[PDB]
């Protein structure tokens with residue numbers, strides 16, 4: 001299955017956001033990060049990444065494709081807008097092995113606010 005996440009300056013959900021900010025996926029799924037606005041990218045939050053998964057960091061203003069096969073939680077940030085809370089979360093499979101790391105990972109205050117809102121969607 002494919003998924004689409006827009007990178008926005010000012011969405012309904014706030015300034016500097018991934019929309020949707022939470023994605024439920026299954027192994028083999030493709031997630032496309034789309035620059036609806038300029039100034040954004042996507043980068044893994046190394047504290048919120050499943051076992052095996054290579055770090056990644058996309059170029060500003062471009063699309064990025066993330067293929068997910070390892071189960072668990074994948075935390076993503078926009079590199080220049082992490083401080084402003086531009087973070088997202090992908091859950092692959094059901095109960096995630098790295099749930100607690102996501103709950104406790106150090107990040108800027110607005111990022112932690114948004115990450116907590118995302119963690120509440122964990123199915």
Ligand SMILES: [Cu+2]
Pocket residue numbers: 007016039040041078079080081086
């Ligand atoms: Cu951004």
